[PDB]
Amino acid sequence: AVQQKLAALEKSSGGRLGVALIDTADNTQVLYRGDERFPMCSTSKVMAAAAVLKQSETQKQLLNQPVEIKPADLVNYNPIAEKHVNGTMTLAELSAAALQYSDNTAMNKLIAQLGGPGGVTAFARAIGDETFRLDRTEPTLNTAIPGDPRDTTTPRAMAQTLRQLTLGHALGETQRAQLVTWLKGNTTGAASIRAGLPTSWTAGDKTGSGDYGTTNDIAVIWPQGRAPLVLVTYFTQPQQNAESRRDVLASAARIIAEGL
Ligand SMILES: O=C(Nc1cccc(-c2nnn[nH]2)c1)c1cccc(-c2ncccn2)c1
Ligand SMILES: O=C(Nc1cccc(-c2nnn[nH]2)c1)c1cccc(-c2ncccn2)c1
Ligand SMILES: O=C(Nc1cccc(-c2nnn[nH]2)c1)c1cccc(-c2ncccn2)c1
Measuring CA to CA, which residue among 211, 255, 186 is closest to residue 21? 255
Q: Among the atoms of ligand 2, which is closest to the Cα of residue 191?
A: 12
Q: Which residues contact 118 (CB under 8 A, 6 or more apart)?
A: 134, 135
Residues β-bridged to residue 236: 16
CB 202 within 8 A of CB 219: no
Catalytic residue (choose from 12, 13, 42, 251): 42
* Residue 42 annotated as catalytic: yes
Resolution as reported, in Å = 1.4
Please work out whether the CB of residue 215 comes within 6 Å of at least one atom of ligand 3. Answer: no
Q: How many CB atoms lie within 10 A of CB 57?
A: 12
User: Residue 219 — φ and ψ, nearest 5°?
Assistant: -135, 150
ω before 149 within 30° of 0 (cis)? no
Spell out the domains of the chain, with CATH numbers in brackets. Answer: 1-260 (3.40.710.10)
> Using CA atoms, how far apart are residues 126 and 254, in angstroms rounded to an integer?
33
Q: Which residues contact 224 (CB under 8 A, 6 or more apart)?
A: 198, 200, 201
CB 171 within 8 A of CB 64: no
CB 192 within 8 A of CB 250: yes
Please work out whether the CB of residue 149 comes within 6 Å of at least one atom of ligand 1. Answer: no
DSSP secondary structure letters along 212-238: TTEEEEEEEEE-TTS--EEEEEEEE-S
Q: Among the atoms of ligand 2, which is closest to the Cα of residue 246?
A: 12
Probe target for ligand 1 pocket from 58, 114, 123, 150, with the most ligand atoms within 8 Å of CB: 114
**Cα 205 to ligand 3 centroid, rounded to whole Å:** 17
Burial of 127-153, coded b for 16+ CB within 10 Å and e otherwise, reads bebebbbbbebbbebbbbeeeeebbbb
Query: Residue 187 to residues 70, 114, 194, 230, 249: CA-CA distances in angstroms?
Result: 25, 25, 12, 19, 17
Q: Among the atoms of ligand 3, which is closest to the Cα of residue 188?
A: 11
Residues β-bridged to residue 206: 218
Please work out whether the CB of residue 100 comes within 6 Å of at least one atom of ligand 2. Answer: no
Query: Which DSSP helix (H) or strand (E) runs through 256?
Result: helix 246-259
Probe target for ligand 3 pocket from 105, 111, 142, 187, with the most ligand atoms within 8 Å of CB: 142
